[model samples]
Structures are given as structure tokens and as C-alpha cells.
Target: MSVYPKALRDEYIMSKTLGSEVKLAFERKTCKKVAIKIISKPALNVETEIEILKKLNHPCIIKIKNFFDAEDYYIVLELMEGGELFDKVVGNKRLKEATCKLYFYQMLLAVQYLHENGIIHRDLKPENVLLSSQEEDCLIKITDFGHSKILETSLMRTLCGTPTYLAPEVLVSVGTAGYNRAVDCWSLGVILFICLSGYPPFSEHRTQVSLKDQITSGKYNFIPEVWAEVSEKALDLVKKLLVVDPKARFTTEEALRHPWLQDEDMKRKFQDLLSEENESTALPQVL
Candidate 1:
């Protein structure tokens, strides 16, 4: 925990996964601040995340500034000032379609890069997304690769990650019949739903049926009042990503080219809608 300089040790900012982060600065460089993540000995999959970070070079992915070895893993990262995307969504329940598109597009780009590298970020959620700044156009930085995996010839068999974001195939995958990177697509779809609708599409509390059943059944509908105002294109993208069959789900490249993401006119309309003052939609607890 004390591997860093006293300058960084006193600037403690936050904690995560039994680890803590502190704002850091180098005497040699003084323009911007950095952060260091401290994880105790025998860290779970710490090296995996570190290895991936070392290889990744994308604006939408968190960068590793530096790292060190010791009884505790010490990793220095580019500081993200705006915090998690979840906090942004929580502050403003339903985001504009344009806003959602902006974030989702960045998410897709990051995922595509990961897949291209033969890596699958098994955990892709709002909490794992960070903003560079508070501005609407701020760059998103996808963080937390604790559950990530580098794919081999065979499909992945590990049933890992949050249950709520797990794909239907992930839930049912058994023995050699396993899953792949498409699982990230399903999670992105769920995130998209929350972005546009202000609530998760499926939840254990909202429906009498079990949460697993709801996800597996792929049974969720948009209440007319809420979704009627939303564009068909937005819904189309969500539907494609949320497909029950992993093979049927949209790939990252396909998602990037989807009309919803590429159309300029629709983007303008969504931007206009967001500019207008509107009532806050009633939100369900994100359990």
C-alpha cells in the first residue's frame, strides 16, 4: 500500500476491489495529475488487467501510465476526472438519444478494438465506463478488466461477470457448449436500454418471474408512453444486440455501421430533443 511517494500517498481519492487509488504527481512532470491503484498481495487476476492495459492504445480505453511490483501490485493510470458513466446516468435519468448514441458508439469502438486483439471484456457495464471530463463530448474510457479473457480456439466456458448483464447464451452455456465475445454485445444492449429508457429492461423486482428467466426468455417491452417518443432506429439497434442467440447478435463492426449510429439527420433531431426542457421520467431502482 505504501510503495508510492509521499506526494501520492496523501492524495488518496478512492477505493475499489479491496484496492485504493490516489492522485499522483511526478516532480519531473507537473502539468497533469495521475492515479495509482493499490491491490494487496495475492491479487485476483491483477496481472491480466495490467497486461491488457500495457497493450491497449485507444482513446476510449483507460491507459496505464506506469506500474511496479511488490507485496501489493502498484499500477499508475491516467487519471479520469469525471468518474463513472453510471453516476452521469443516475444524475440525469434518461439521456438523449444523441447522447446515448455518442456513448454507445464509443463503447462499440472500444469493444471492437478489444475483440480485434483476441480479448473479451467479460464485464462491460456503466460502472466500468469513465469520462475524461464532464463535457457532453468528453471521451469515454472503458476501465476494469478484472474479468476479461483472451480467447483461444474453443469457446469460453467460464460463467463469470454480473448476472444482470449476462447474455442468454452465457446463462445456458454448459460443458463444451460455451460462449464468446458476443456476451459484451448483450451487455451493451442492456446499457443502451437504460440510457434511452431510464430503467433496465429486465429486473427481478419489476417482474414476478425470476431475473434469469426474464433474461433467458428475452421478454421485455417498451411501454408506449416511454418508447413512443424514441426513434425506431434506436430500438432496432437495441433489439439486434439483445438477440437471444449469440450468433444472431450484432457484431461490433455491424453495430458501428447501423443506420442509427450513421444517420446525421436523426442525430440532429435527437440533439434538439435533448436541448428542450422536459420532465424527468419516473425511474425504477437499478437493482
Candidate 2:
């Protein structure tokens, strides 16, 4: 019954309480752009995301402006208008190689920042990456912390993350899981393949029929005609990411250092784009 905050931010937007959760949107507000995420009770993961956002000082990662509890979960974050990478790649079409490279590097930076701080973005998919704006050189902020975890230990055995983007170690049906933050690196590899190729490298239709069989097979398709020019180094990173053995895959730091992702030219391009923004905007609305 008590929904109105003691103090309203502005007349542009007001409290919008929804069932189970409340989403304060700026759709009706003009010029003023901000969204408030309020979830009831305690949400450890959300709190963890806030913690990560607070400590993370990366230019490409999401920014949390302010947050405090009001008898529930409350978070104030930057609002991005670039939309979702999912729409750009899947809804529109495959991204150009250069464009994909730009996004991939930014993603690598984000994960690298997280890993350095011992955080793991368990869910690293197109949907999780949000665009800062519609600009060609727009920045991407990786959102969604519901599946993220702090990598303070040796392994994460929980069966979290979406099935489609699950790493091979995650695909294991039995045995104690021995995955680490490297899982995020593998997911980023999947994201990179999907962005450049329009579809996942190991999708059902791409190769074989059965999903389980596809997992066991672990073979990826590289449409020569379209991806013939795609750098071999890039493909190598993908292969290393998709390795059935999690230990064999690249860690966030190592992936960032890979030649394909950390190519000198690519780093310069991303740095230019990030310098242009210079400030943390709100997380974009992609839903």
C-alpha cells in the first residue's frame, strides 16, 4: 500500500509498482531519463551486482549511481538508450566483422574488470549486453546480475545460466562441477560467434539434430563464404573458449590478452569510443 517514496526525484517520472517487483521508468518523462529497480525483500545476487558495480571502475561496464533499501530492494542506475545487442544481431542481421570486434573487445574489458575483482558474470549473452546508444561507436554495458557470482573459491558447481549458451563444463550432466570465472569467457566466445555469424557456432540446425548429441560432438560451423575473411586468431579464440575442458579455456584476463581480442588496432578503436563517452550512463532498456 505504501508505494510513494518519501521524496520524488522529479515530475518526469514517478513510482511504478508492479507485482512481485516495481519498475520505475522514464518513458513518460521528457529529457529526464532514469529507471529505478525495486525488488521486495533481500536479493543477494542483486546486492552482489550492486557491490560489483560500485567497485568496478571500467568505462565499458554498467554504472550504479545510488542505491538504498526502502522496505525492499532498490537500485538507481544509469539509463542507456542504445537498446539490446540481441536486436542488432539477431533481429537485424549479423554484425560487420569490425563492428563485432568492437563489441567483443568492450565485452572482454567488462569481464576482465569483473574477473580482476573476483566477480564472474555467469550469464554472458547478447541479451545481457546492452548498447549505450544508437551511435555507430556506442558503448556496450553488460547488464543482468541475477546469475552472476563472486569467484572467491575454486569452482562454481551451480547449474546456473541459460541452456543455449551453456559452456561444455556447464553442459556436464553429472559429476561435481569444476568451472570457474572462465565460464564467462566461454560464453563471450559464443556471443562473439553469434554476433559475427548471425547464429551460434554449435546450434542444432548448424550441425546435427539432437541437442545432447550436439554437445557431445562440440563441432562448430564456419560458413567459409561469409566468414572466410574472419581472422584465424579470432577463430582460434572461439575454439579455445568452446573447449570441453573448462581448464583448457581462456580465463577472462587471458582472453583479453589474446591477439584476436586485444589486437593493437582494436584496442585503439575501443579506447577512442570510450573516451568519447567519458561518463557512465544508465543501463539501456532492451526488453
Candidate 3:
């Protein structure tokens, strides 16, 4: 990602391409790191993202710096030193459930904050989960608020059914099935599934069922082949969140209080991680 393009020369020294024009840049004055993204006429409306971010203020959420309008819109964001959770350990066999607790606990705190603030971060997934630093234990920052919507009745359904993490109701298509904040909880289950088991919870193959079929019916497995290491209580929480029935699905508040998080060491570690800001923080081998 470290390709400094020739077209840019300004206050910040652009370093890497996070996406098309969403490059990682640093302040030339004091070398402070930040992410700079260019929004053109085509992807014009980052208005919802900026607006939603303004309403959010939590340690586990991303911080937006400001906007610079011209031929293209500039979204300067506070750089997350640790990259995406997907890159960090989506399929790493070496990763332990203890590590998942570190990030997962923070994810819940962020989700709780979002739900309390009237925002549904429907795009919750490993990619949107960023770590505060390179530390194995760090604050999980939820980013990419573009797909989120304010939880005011009619504004519920998300067209952005992110395949792997889509809740059953999200795939109901024409909406109106009481799509609520629980989709984030459903997605959190899928994310937790991958983190602990080392592969996505769903699959798409001729011999096996397709993604839609498996998700709509809540059909998934914790193969003893790779799932032996996960604790029963941990498995309990995942099952609670992955419930196909949204009403039965565990909300962030409920999930946070589950026995998995209530463990003495887990509870104490959660508080410790919260107080210590993990400053800056990849992905992997499946077998």
C-alpha cells in the first residue's frame, strides 16, 4: 500500500492506497498519521457517513477529522494503526479464543454505544473492525459508517447484504420484516465464528449448500476438526447471537453479559484494555 502517487502535494504526505483515493497520509508538519479519502461525484454522498460520525463519540468508534470540498470531497480520518480484523486473524489457525475475547469485548462496547446513539452499524464485519494498535489486545474501532442508518422505524433495512455476515432478515429482500439493530449482533456472531474457527461460517459450493441457503436457515457447524479449542461458554454466546429469529438473537447488551464475558478474568481484562489505549496494530494461514 506504500505507493506515494505523484499527483498529490499538500499539507499531508500521502503514503498508501487504502482504496482508490483513500490513501494513508501523514501530516508533513509533525508526521501525525491520518487517512485521507477522495470522494468524487460518482460516490458523492459521504454525507450520511460524516453526519453519523458527528453523532458518535466513543473509544471504540472511528474519529473523523474534517471535510475539504472541491472537485472531490476529502474525508480525513484518524488513522487506525492496526489494520482490519480480517487481515489480522480471520483465518489464522494460530489465533486463540483468548485473543478473540480481547477484540470481541471491545466490539460489543462499540456496538452498545452505536445502538444507544440511535445508529445501526449494519455494515459490521471483520473488515470494518480495526484495532487501535499492533498489540494482540487492543481497542476495536468500528469504521465504515456509510451503510449505517438512524434507527427511526422506516429507515431500517440495509440493501448492503454483505454475503457472509448477512442476517436472515437482511436477505428478506423487499424489507418490512422488522429489521432492527440485531443484524449487527447476527454479524458479530459470524465474525466471532470466523475468529475462533478459522473460516467463514457459511459456504458456496455445488456439493455443499450455497451462502443464502445456509444463512436463511441458520445452518452452520463448529467442526470438532478445528473447533475443539473453543470453550462451551464461548460457543453458547455465538449460538445466542446467530439465532435466525431476530427476537431470539442476543443484542449487544445481552451478549455483553453472557457467561463468556462475565468470567472473572475476562471482566477484569475488559476493564484493563479499556483504560489502556492500544496505540497501533494482520491475517493469515488457515491450515
Candidate 4:
């Protein structure tokens, strides 16, 4: 593919996000619509994020079409116009059962796919899940794998990722150097529950309060309203997934077969939505 000037098509820059990012449309000879993510050469995690992208290639996960590092790292990626799920939930308060399912199902599939490939996405949250566009029934793509890692073993003991989404075992590890991929599963459960209810299982009454206290005590409550429409199967699955014990957490295959996902209807939809094609579609236009 021929590289176009970063400003071709008179690119309109999108806001700077999580890491340093500028959304520009590149007029490549082979592709018309493409989003280019340029990470400044000096950014703290630029190389780390680039390496993660190079190792990942999945439909539900964001795609990096091409990359070239000059003075800065230029990552030519697919344009996913849908903004973050964090903005959506905070704006809507809570999502309808079907809507919540749409978001959660995609996330579960994305995270499961990563884990199966021996990769662990340490950061799994609404902020990282983006919509396809403002269009109706837009597909969700899991983005921002900056903290992800392919574990040499089944577990990794690194204490990392956003605090709100951290699992209990992550904070209380008793010298176990590797916490396995299960940490991602726990984060997935927190995201699903929050998307449905518009809040997490745990929250600090004050900002100064320690996060460890909340996770250790397991201070969280499920909303009855959200729970009513949510199937017992899904609710139970979330409960089991959010366990503090990393040693006993669910594996990707196990979570895929859990009652929530095992339901005939859910399973069929999950498989279809997660088919290989979903992971790789022709690139879209980036604004």
C-alpha cells in the first residue's frame, strides 16, 4: 500500500486521548478510507503500545494495518468512529438489557479471543470499547491494548491496569509472581456489570480512601432493576467470574461455555458476531 501524506484529504484531527493520538485521514493509493494513529516518538509508552499492536490481529480487537517509525511512530489503523463506551454509559446512566448484551458480548468475545491466542489484555473497560459509528446497530471494537502482554506462562503477576477494574487477587498476591490471564476475566465481569447497571461492584466513598480496602472487603451491590431483566445465567456467570481468587478464575474456553454464553440464542449470536470476518473488515474512513 502506498503511503499518503498524513494530511491528505485535509485531515481533521480528533481529540488527543488515553495516549497521545491524532486522528488523521490518509489518502493511500490502495485504500480510500483509513485512520492513522501517530504516536509521538517520545511518548512514554509509544513503543510498548506499538509492539502490542504488532502482536495482535483479531476482528473484535482493533487492527493495525501498517506501521512505520520515522521521527515518530506512525500506526496506520482501521477507522473505528464509535467513541468510548465510558462516555456512553455515563451519559445514559444504564443500558437496556439487549444493548448491554451487545456491548458485553463483544467485549467477552474480544477478551476471550486474545487470551486464547496466548495474549492477555490487562486493560478491559468501557473506555477501551468503541462503537463503529453513530449509526444504529453499530459493531463494537475493543481498542487500546497498551497494557496487554502475551504471557510466557498461563499467569502474570504484574500489578497493573486501571484501579477500578483490578481483581482482588491482583492486590493481595502473596508473592505469587504470575497472576494468570484470569485477571482479564475479572475485568470483563466488572465492565459487563457496569454497562448494564451503570456502576461497578465497588466504589470508594472518598477519593483519598485506599482501593485495596474496597477490593479486600468486596463492597459492591447489584442493582435489582438491572438484575430483573438480566438472566440468572448471566448474573451467576458474572458472580463466578469476579471471584477474588485468581487461581480459581475462569479460563477463556470455560467462560465462553458458561451458562450466560451457553444459552442457545446467546451462543449462536456470540459465534456469529465473533466469526473471523468480524475481526477483519475492509478499512473504514477515519475522520
Any residue pairs clashing in model 3, and if so which?
82-281, 87-282, 87-283, 88-282, 133-280, 133-281, 134-280, 134-281
Query: How many steric clashes between backbone atoms does each model show?
Result: 0, 4, 8, 7
TM-score of 2: 0.74
| 219: Cα error in model 2, Å | 2.1
lDDT-better candidate, 3 vs 4: 3
Cα displacement (Å) at residue 106, model 2: 1.2
lDDT of 3 by residue, 1-287 (tens): 33223344566776778754677988777688898877765352478888888778888898888666666667788787777787866445545888888788889989999888888888888888887778776667898887887773322434444468766665664443545888999999999988888777777733377788899999885478777778988888988988998877898989988889876776677678766653343134487
Best prediction by lDDT: 3
Instruction: Count residue pairs with overlapping backbones in model 2.
Output: 4
What is the per-residue lDDT of model 1 for residues 167-208, given as tens digits with 9 covering 90 to 100? 677556553242489899999999898888877888765458
Clash pairs of candidate 4?
Answer: 59-279, 82-131, 155-180, 156-179, 156-180, 157-178, 157-179
Model 3 residue 194 CA deviation in Å: 0.4
- Candidates ranked, most accurate by TM-score first: 3, 1, 2, 4
lDDT of each: 0.75, 0.71, 0.77, 0.67
Q: After superposition, how far is residue 148 of candidate 4 from its true place, in Å?
A: 1.7
Cα RMSD to the true fold for all candidates: 11.7, 9.2, 9.8, 8.9
- Candidate 4 lands at a TM-score of 0.72
| Model 4 CA lDDT for position 38 | 66
Among these predicted structures, which one has the highest TM-score? Answer: 3
Q: How do all models score by TM-score?
A: 0.75, 0.74, 0.80, 0.72
